[PDB]
Structure 1
């Protein structure tokens, strides 16, 4: 009788905070992961200790290929197998690295466009075909002021705005809402050094600090809740004003 949600890339960082906060709200969860098997199993163990039979894991690579549609169908199917329903899809998984214009390029394309855009589209198709239903896409507040040399990443995130709009329009007559949450700087890349992390922190007007994963998850919670039942096609920036700051 509890609703169920799929969260992609939910083993760590922002997807983990979203899975935790959905679980705290009453949801049963599918924790999708690609490589982070130990962290995924550890999170599902922690949620199941809190309410038994309320969490499963589901492994899949979201890189574009001719078998991506079957993998995305399987992610949705795993929610129905464990819980008998699927009320919420959160498209959180994402590849992120530079692709300068001046891995082979076709693998770069498959990974950055597949995880950020194609996989969300196919998960959206499988979600809708299997049916307060809603989908939330993790977008990027800086998509119009992009990082230098991130053209494929930026293309995938713009494509994800277009999917949020197109699917909100096409799925409205089934009662499925589709919206996005657009972080600015939240948890900084593990690879990143401390002086560089501070450099980004200092650009944020509201507090000169990055968003916690929980602050990002809070906006996801609102969008799936009964307090957003007339909201579809909207993207909420959660960026502390970063996107307002000129060069």
Structure 2
């Protein structure tokens, strides 16, 4: 039988590239989305056309809030994402924690608050609950029926040790996700679940600024003097999920073109 990957925030950009990369290796893919229903469903369509019954889409707000049905908690919503894989395909072999909100939370001058739950939920708390659910399902599976290549990838940030000015909550949340990578790798090793991180520097940079400014930022990357393509990140995620990487756990791989080696 065919292995299953759950990719959060899979609709576009890096998540899509990760979903596509995994699909190209033969994985059936559960495509999580929050607001990008159209893009997610379009991606599912493409993948199901190449290979029937190889893609589904699930909607979830991964912010640390209760939602409307008692109210539904984030944990419950995370458990149902993993469950959707089991209900549809009877398994979940790979989890990619990719979904992530990203915007300023300045230290210096119902916003703020919202911001805390959105940024911490998507980047840190939801990944925790998702890993918990993922692990619970593997533990609950009889050893003889388990998959042979369980892999969890956390999308971190190569640059957060050189924090982006005004992005504290985001930076804090990636710090937490790094901790989750290490703690989960240790605790889930007995179940042969590998937990690793991939950290982009600058990838698929949006040109929503003066062209010369866009160019200024990307030119700072020592290698190629440009931001990465989506595939340049996703191919690494795909390798780490492959059985050739089966001795790697608890580690974060920078995919940053040497950007973290720079100084002001």
* TM-score where L is the length of structure 2: 0.92
**Is residue 120 of structure 1 aligned with residue 137 of structure 2?**
no
Distance 1:172 1:163 in 2: 14
| Corresponding position of 2:212 | 195
Distance 1:12 1:241 in 2: 25
The worse-fitting range, judged by mean Cα deviation, of 102-111 and 12-21 is 102-111
Q: CA RMSD of the aligned region, Å?
A: 1.0
- The alpha carbon displacement at 1:196 in A equals 2.6
- The alpha carbon displacement at 1:192 in A equals 4.3
SS of residue in 2 equivalent to 1:47: helix
Equivalences for 1:67-82 in 2 at 5 Å? 67-82=73-88
The worse-fitting range, judged by mean Cα deviation, of 185-194 and 106-115 is 185-194
* TM-score where L is the length of structure 1: 0.98
| Corresponding position of 1:210 | 227
- The alpha carbon displacement at 1:208 in A equals 0.3
Which 5+ residue runs of structure 2 have no aligned equivalent? 67-72, 139-148
| Corresponding position of 1:94 | 100
The worse-fitting range, judged by mean Cα deviation, of 189-198 and 6-15 is 189-198
SS of residue in 1 equivalent to 2:95: strand
Which 5+ residue runs of structure 1 have no aligned equivalent? none
SS of residue in 1 equivalent to 2:32: strand
SS of residue in 2 equivalent to 1:182: strand
| Corresponding position of 1:60 | 60
| Corresponding position of 2:175 | 158
Q: Which has the larger radius of gyration?
A: 2
Distance 1:179 1:91 in 2: 10
Count residues with an aligned counterpart. Answer: 247
Once the two structures are superposed, residues 38-97 of structure 1 have per-residue CA deviations (whole angstroms, 9 ceiling, x without a partner) of 000000000000000110000000000241001100110111111110000000000000
